[PDB]
Symmetry: D2
Subunit: 237 residues, 4 copies
């Protein structure tokens, strides 16, 4: 199966696959069952921001998700990603809905990876930023239900003509280029990612969440990964 | 045919197709016959640096090529690249040899494009930088004779195991992701590129040169574009 | 006197000192009488954005000012700023009112200078960005009437507690650190600046405008440089 | 006294102020007695690189010091810098010599601080890079024995006409502008710093080290801070 490191913004507790019993942010290393979570109060209809930060020095994958009112949830997990990810990866955003639903709208996404040193501050680096997505976003690989619109947004999961989110949707957006996420001579292999998102639901409960993820270059949506699997995993192991 | 904008470092004066009677740098818009050139003293076996700058406001494509001794040639050409390039492009480096030859070694290559908007610092951007190339540089599309080495370099044209350049060689390297080079909504679209190169020859005369180029996304080396055509054009028109 | 290079957003046509007979953006090299202007429709109470671009290769100072409705004015002037500016400068924003007035509110300001060299990507660079200003913005030198607020803005000219702009006001904000704007060794010296602004007036006519400027490091507001002199010049020569 | 957070490259073990008994890198929070150290093999006469990385999310101050051959020393310390540093700081490089000596030459220094969010990926940020220092480096505050030369380097401590390092020298270089290192509404306050350095000694033992440090804006060299105090502290508490 794919190799996945993800930071999940998990709006729906699936307590029989180990979610805590509240909306939460989580760090997922090779399992949907997050290695670490923190409670997260998803603010329906507000634009949120997620920041994901890793470097090979401190070896701590960190994420914060905030809303403009200042509410924030942070999670960090000590992990040497050199030991989990392949050298080359693709980076992406994923989301899903299941029985319950939500819009999984991305307003913006930036990513930076840097491989530094072996020497004077020379470097291999990739940075992209999308503050507006285009209807035909050639540098994004859209998978499953993900679309880009003329509203400048990326709709990770399905939305109806009347703006209403659909169930059992899964969608992703990967940056087109593979990313050299580590390289054993790099003294520092850092990455960081920021996305802004708008999760809205009129469901009794929003679901299922959004994740930023890093995968093998050829990663595709695992079949059956709607709902609690977030477009990321073939199963809940 | 492809659409090409290029900055050529032309080491071989083909005076019969409009080259000046010296090695030169030039700006190429849809033709190998540069709209603008400047006399360039290629320094054999020395590491040069090429910087290429454009923005949609000044509408001036500029390049400078310099060497460690301080010698520099610059060429600028006023052009509205919105009227020439497709909205999405790929960017690359190209090089050729013909009857005369030279190493067309790239030691580093960076590129930045930005689409800035009617707002603030909300920007779409791609930035990459390669200060070392890997053998399996998965974020480069290698065409023709181009290879990436264990020496950390990009050899655009064929070099034998003994280190000698070969003639009638052509090769390019394009960044894997398409680039959104202009977008009608943007107030400023800018790009910049830098690369460092080492052109060495022990021929009677070095040839043919290195270009940074921007092309249609599906650009391939035009058939028979070795020699004076720099791997960029099907003919010398 | 100070040495000034500026991009003026001139909201008040002082036709008696060479302004065109409309609000305009202009490029000012050592004089309030712009070397180049373009007709600019200042949109009262709307947030505008100004981008200023220069590099030492193209030698073209460019600016564009736009508003959210898409209206845009651009002005470019060919000039070799090496021949005008001192090697070290301070960069700033300036604004004035006179008999007529307007808020000269800056909501954001970024600036990048780079000196790139005869080598690779070895570069000296300064980059700052302010998307919010603090009350005690210790990295800004405020001159004259300029203040920074709790509203996160930079008020270049005096605004009363009731929110009303005042006349005969002048103020500037310079970044605290001097900037190395050119250096003889560098192959490329470039800068760019962006700022966003909100010029509101309920006067018979707004005046006088906002400038981005670059000055000698020890620049102060010239005495009596309110009104049409934009806080940049001692006289209208 | 000043408030100091530093990353020390401590070439001389002063085991009666708690150094371990080998050259080491250390994280210093408000004491020269590092909260954490790692053994470091300083390679005499080679150019080293130090990277220092912090973010407010993972709350882990990290440093790696490497040499081109690949040898590396890393240290990380979990610390919430919001609770140690003032909001505004200056950033600098410091070094000293004592009874024993070394050159404390900085070849380059970059710093980035970013305050992100409360919102969509807008930001206050400062980045500078010096890959070459100038004889009169106006954007550096040189303190004590620090000088910049025409060789493009910063000599933190004293060197004689014949290139030989002197004892009981202390010197620093601070970036001229204060830095807003944290701000309580910032969802992410990150900084990173890289310097390359050349420590050479013909002493029986090199001393005393180089540090990157963050201090109160008005920080100056504490009197008596040569030697083991590294220009950073008034004493060894
Ligand atoms: O009754 C069938 C199941 O419905 C829920 O699970 C689905 O809906 C969720 C979407 O919010 C997803 O997390 C999940 O993957 C879907 O299968 C319910 O939570 C399950 O317990 C039920 O078996
Ligand atoms: O500087 C001239 C160099 O290039 C020439 O290019 C022409 O030669 C071939 C004719 O069939 C083609 O491969 C090529 O595309 C022509 O335009 C020549 O080949 C070389 O002598 C020179 O190095
Ligand atoms: O657009 C004209 C505006 O500025 C004018 O500026 C002149 O007025 C004063 C005369 O003593 C000086 O303070 C100033 O420097 C002059 O150049 C005028 O003050 C205003 O009416 C207008 O808003
Ligand atoms: O004999 C006097 C002291 O000399 C050494 O300490 C000085 O030299 C060192 C430079 O390498 C510094 O670390 C120190 O601050 C200087 O005071 C010796 O290590 C000390 O034990 C002696 O007291
Ligand atoms: Ca879940
Ligand atoms: Ca030619
Ligand atoms: Ca005027
Ligand atoms: Ca010590
Ligand atoms: Mn979960
Ligand atoms: Mn030519
Ligand atoms: Mn004017
Ligand atoms: Mn120590």
């Amino acid at each position: 199966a794919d190799t996945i490191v993800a930071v999940e913004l998990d709006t729906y507790p699936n307590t029989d696959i180990g979610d805590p019993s509240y909306p939460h942010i989580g760090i997922d290393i090779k399992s949907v069952r997050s290695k670490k979570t923190a409670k997260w109060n998803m603010q329906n209809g507000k634009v949120g921001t997620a920041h994901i930060i890793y470097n090979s020095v401190g070896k701590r994958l960190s994420a914060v998700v905030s809303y403009p009112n200042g509410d924030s949830a942070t999670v960090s997990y000590d992990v040497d990603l050199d030991n989990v990810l392949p050298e080359w990866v693709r980076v992406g955003l994923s989301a899903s809905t299941g029985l319950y639903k939500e819009t999984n709208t991305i307003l913006s996404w930036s990513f930076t990876s840097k491989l530094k040193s072996n020497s004077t501050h020379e470097t291999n680096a990739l940075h992209f930023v999308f503050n507006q997505f285009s209807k035909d976003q050639k540098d994004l690989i859209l998978q499953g239900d993900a679309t880009t619109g003329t509203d400048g947004n990326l709709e990770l999961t399905r939305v109806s003509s009347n703006g209403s989110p659909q169930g059992s949707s899964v969608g992703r957006a990967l940056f087109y280029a593979p990313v050299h996420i580590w390289e054993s001579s790099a003294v520092v292999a850092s990455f960081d990612a920021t996305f802004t998102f708008l999760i809205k639901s009129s469901d009794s409960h929003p679901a299922d969440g959004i994740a930023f993820f890093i995968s093998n270059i050829d990663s595709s949506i695992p079949s059956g990964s709607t709902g609690r699997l977030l477009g990321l995993f073939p199963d809940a192991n």
